[PDB]
Design a binder for these strands. Structure first.
Lengths: 91, 141, 149, 129
RNA sequence: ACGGGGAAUCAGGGUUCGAUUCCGGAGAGGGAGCCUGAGAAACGGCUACCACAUCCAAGGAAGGCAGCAGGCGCGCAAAUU
RNA sequence: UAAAGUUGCUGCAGUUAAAAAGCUCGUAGUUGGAUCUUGGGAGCGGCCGUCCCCUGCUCGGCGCCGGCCCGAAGCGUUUACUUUGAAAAAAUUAGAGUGUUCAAAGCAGGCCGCCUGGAUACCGCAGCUAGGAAUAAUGGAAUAGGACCGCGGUUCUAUUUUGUUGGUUUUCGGAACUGAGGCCAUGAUUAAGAGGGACGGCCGGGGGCAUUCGUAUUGCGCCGCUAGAGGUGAAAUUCUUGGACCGGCGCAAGACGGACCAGAGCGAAAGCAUUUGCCAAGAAUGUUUUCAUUAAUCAAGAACGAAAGUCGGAGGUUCGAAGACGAUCAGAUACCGUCGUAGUUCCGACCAUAAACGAUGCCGACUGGCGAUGCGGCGGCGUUAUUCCCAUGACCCGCCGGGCAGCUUCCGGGAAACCAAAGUCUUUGGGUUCCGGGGGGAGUAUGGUUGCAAAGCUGAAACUUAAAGGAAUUGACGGAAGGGCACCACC
RNA sequence: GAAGACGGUCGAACUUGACUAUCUAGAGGAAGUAAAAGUCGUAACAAGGUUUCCGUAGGUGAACCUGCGGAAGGAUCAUUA
RNA sequence: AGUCGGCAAGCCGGAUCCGUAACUUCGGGAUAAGGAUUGGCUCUAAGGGCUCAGCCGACUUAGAACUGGUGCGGACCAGGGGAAUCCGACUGUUUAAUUAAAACAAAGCAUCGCGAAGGCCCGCGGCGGGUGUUGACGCGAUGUGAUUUCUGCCCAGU
């Protein structure tokens, strides 16, 4: 059954820390515990080891990533930006 | 009708059953609100006790002082302002006299000159007020 | 008018009155079928067998040269695809627009088109179920749909 | 969409009569339509009509005279007893002298007076006067 | 809101009423229990409790008109002990 | 109760008077294209009216020479509908009879012992019975487990029989199965100016992401020359020899996408405009492609939904709610002016409202022209581009489809304004959603629900009131416009 | 074969509590309507003297003002290569 | 009714089965509140392994009868409850030996300094030292104190 109405993972905090702080931590705490698909082996095993460090439990390959997400949006725009200046310098 | 299906009876009938409530005359007859707010309570007449004689003003260029009484019904205990109908009939009525009051004629609606008065006296102390006006009978004391 | 668009266009084919085999056509009722058999084996939906047939070989309607129609010809030979082609092409389209949508999630229009496409899938599905062409428990599920190209 | 086919046929030949066309074309032809036109043709209200029977729902070209006031259709097809058939032609027909209510019975499709002779009612189709 | 046969009002459709003499049901102040009998959960039959009320010598005894009349009450509102 | 066609099934209304959800999707509900048997014959009346026939497979007497005729019993897709019959308490209603002196009643009465009455109709809806087969549903055989025709075997069994007394096997009748057949005209309506899908070349400020460019604005740096510059009805606040404004050259930042731009296009609506690339989508057109009714409209439910607003980040040029100030004014906490916060921009979540307007639901049909216009297709002189012509572009003349519109009119409608739809409406019924019922109170109170909040959705009553309102007309009026006039007007 | 008793059953009624419906008191608060001709303005109707109106914000004695985006129910169906 | 004051004492208490309001940050409140049951004994039913039947094995729950001077969580163990106000969100910490609080801290919020020859700071001194094995999502300095909803006017004085 659906145990809670609108309090997901953050149900562990009970009635503490206020509603908004318990709401904006939910989106983050769902992310930092989700298992991602490893882009190297394909299996859904990318799991955050420590802050910024993401380890794939299958191919045993460690990746430097965001603090709470696997990929920071600021990073993916930088990777695509560098990829354009790279081919633009060497032509 | 809009839908003329061969078997749209419950759609047509439930519509009129719904839209009937938007008729003002129908909605007051099939809800207690009109019947509870009625001091008579669906009765055509009512007896009450006159406790003061008040004069009501007229409104529009029709200017005068309408003679009325503040009656307290004996079945409910509510207070209504009955209108002593005819000329010089206030001197028949006194204080603490039970009087038969009736509707005015517009069925819960202030009538013409008088503002907010929906009741008129017909009998006073179990003798018709018209008989007092014609002199056919006089007040027994 | 179109059932998922405001267009009221009037454009379609118009087969002639005469239902006879053309006087120019020299293919027998047999040889046309083995032509359908060959194209069906190399992979071709009954819709596009008909077009290839009336351009290269010049068959007006297969329903006239033989007594049956294309899909009825393939199913009697067992070469028909399992799920119908118009339902296949709708799932194929929904899979593409869903794959476009996972990256481009700000495309509210693609999200709107997806609902229109899926609504057409569930409409054909419940039709192909009453005609007992699909198993009564068949169900298009967005997840497992991509396995069916 | 086109739900009732007899309705599209009557409203077209009723429109073309008010305009004064000599002959009108109706797009779909059904068995009930041609049975309806003959009831009107046997009373002189329309002219000679023709069915262009192609390999689809055929087309009818009805020669029109100036004798048709209105040929309406009653939808849906209510059931008519012989007890209430007088009450229908009381508020559907112009006068008691002329006008006909076409209604289908098990005996076929005919006007309301033939339904009096054969003593059987049925579903009502339309009316013309 | 006891139901129905019906009643009022209508061109055709309807709308509103039906406590009321015919049929059916329900009930005898409120609930409950039961004796007798072919038939009753009977009340112009019993047994309780609740409400109300009568007679008493103060120990007790006795009661059920939504039967016909009649009275009180209630009311705008309804007859002869 | 009628009047009230002011509850509208018959029979209302929804452009502006009360009113069509912002928009699309969508389940119940409602409604659904066409298509399967007509004709012929005997008789009668003056080509016409009426009758019957196109029914198949146990028992008996006009009987007659296994067959025929006839009578009765049984079976023959199913409902809806319709016709018939039955069964259907009276009283009441309708209604027959009858001089209660008439009548409302009543069921009695009528003749010189007799003669008669106390009828009949309606009593739905549901259930029962018989007929009809249009209309509307529904089914049959296309992996043939199809229908018929005879079979061959297997199992059990009424048994009639074995003269009777037993067992046994069978012909025998029945029930079931299983193999080989034979035969069928052997079984699939059409392909909608319904729909879906495919395919073809296009098309479009459709959507998304990325990229690019453009002046301008603001700011800064430097250079020049200078005393005002700004702003206004007029000014001031403000900037200014600490060099403002102006001119030049640079730089940075964030917005915005001018002119081209249209009663043009695209999109469900909101909405959409520098370049180029990528991604997915789509209408219309073309189609001798495919599927074969898959459809229409839609309570519940769902997606999207300008601006403002909200919550997080990033950025903050311009503009600018609030605020401050300068004017104006009787006062201005307003209009005007100078600054200027939130906001305006982007990203990610909320919000679900707009005069979200065409104040006009959607689908379908029909009913006048006319000139254009956009997209696609088809046809045709000629002109002009490649040039080297055919084919393609650009014009030119037409036709077809649908698309935004326009003009015109006695189609027709409308209270009119006006409308080719707001028409085909007392000659009233194509299908289907929503929704209105005098004005206020009031979209308020309350309850519920959604939201972070703002609020949204749902949504009364008491009380009050004789009008409120629509379109149009004539006046008066206007710090409205255009002409003209007067020393009771000015110059 | 009476009284009486154990147990069972039906179970009135009382006590208590909860839920529910209807009516009703209430300081104070905040509306609506009516009465009259009060005070302060002048928002609206003529370009009503800042065009009006809508949604949404903020503000101000009060009508209202302003910002942003709409609408014409506008004072323009029109403005020229 | 005592008293400044229900201080102290008392009531409540386990478990099983029912039942559970306002309010709310939707998680709670909550053992809310309020009820009933509970012993002994004799049984029945259900819940497993090993080779249909046979052979082993454990505990536990539910139900029934009988029974006692209505007594049964018999000792022990073991929450009184409710509705409202004020303050502080909470957990945490604090005056060892008179003050455990409403004080302090706190997450959150908002300012300020600083791009390293630097900010802040130490040090009698030095090419000294800490932050710093650091680099603005960092370090240093302050105020306020979760959330929700807001945060107005004043730059004359200092």
């Amino acid at each position: 059954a659906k145990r809670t109405k609108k309090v997901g993972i953050v149900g562990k905090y009970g009635t503490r820390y206020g509603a908004s702080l318990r709401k904006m931590v939910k989106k983050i705490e769902i992310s930092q515990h989700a298992k991602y698909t490893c882009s190297f082996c394909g299996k859904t095993k990318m799991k955050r080891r420590a802050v910024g460090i993401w380890h794939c439990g299958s191919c045993m390959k460690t990746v430097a990533g965001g603090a709470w997400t696997y990929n920071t949006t600021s990073a993916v725009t930088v990777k695509s930006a560098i990829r354009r200046l790279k081919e633009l310098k060497d032509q | 009708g809009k839908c003329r299906g061969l078997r749209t009876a419950r759609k047509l009938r439930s519509h009129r059953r719904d839209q009937k409530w938007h008729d003002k005359q129908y909605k007051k007859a099939h809800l207690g609100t009109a019947l509870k707010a009625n001091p008579f309570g669906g009765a055509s007449h009512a007896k009450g006790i006159v406790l003061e004689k008040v004069g009501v003003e007229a409104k529009q260029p029709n200017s005068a002082i309408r003679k009325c009484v503040r009656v307290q019904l004996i079945k409910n205990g509510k207070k209504i302002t009955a209108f002593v109908p005819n000329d010089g009939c206030l001197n028949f009525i006194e204080e603490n006299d039970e009087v038969l009051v009736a509707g005015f004629g517009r069925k819960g609606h202030a009538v013409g000159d008088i503002p907010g008065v929906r009741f008129k006296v017909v009998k006073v102390a179990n003798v018709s007020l018209l008989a007092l006006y014609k002199g056919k009978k006089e007040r027994p004391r | 008018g179109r059932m998922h668009a405001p267009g009221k266009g009037l454009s379609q084919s118009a087969l002639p009155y005469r239902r006879s085999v053309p006087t120019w056509l020299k293919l027998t009722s047999d040889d046309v079928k083995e032509q359908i058999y060959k194209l069906a084996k190399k992979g071709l939906t009954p819709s596009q067998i008909g077009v290839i047939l009336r351009d290269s070989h010049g068959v007006a309607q297969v329903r006239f040269v033989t007594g049956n129609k294309i899909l009825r010809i393939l199913k009697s030979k067992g070469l028909a695809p399992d799920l119908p082609e118009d339902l296949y092409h709708l799932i194929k389209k929904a899979v593409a627009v869903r794959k476009h949508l996972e990256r481009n999630r700000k495309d509210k229009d693609a999200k709107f088109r997806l609902i229109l496409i899926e609504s057409r899938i569930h409409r054909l599905a419940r039709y192909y179920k009453t005609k007992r062409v699909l198993p009564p428990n068949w169900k298009y599920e967005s997840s497992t749909a991509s396995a069916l190209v | 969409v086109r739900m009732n086919v007899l309705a599209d046929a009557l409203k077209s030949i009723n429109n073309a009569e008010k305009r004064g066309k000599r002959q009108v074309l109706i797009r779909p032809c059904s068995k009930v339509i041609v049975r309806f036109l003959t009831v009107m043709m046997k009373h002189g209200y329309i002219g000679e009509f023709e069915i262009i029977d192609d390999h689809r729902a055929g087309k009818i070209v009805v020669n029109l005279t100036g004798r048709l006031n209105k040929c309406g259709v009653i939808s849906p097809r209510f059931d008519v007893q012989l007890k209430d058939l007088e009450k229908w032609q009381n508020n559907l027909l112009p006068s008691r002298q002329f006008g006909f209510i076409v209604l289908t019975t098990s005996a076929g499709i005919m006007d309301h007076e033939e339904a009096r002779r054969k003593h059987t009612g049925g579903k009502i189709l339309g009316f013309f006067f």
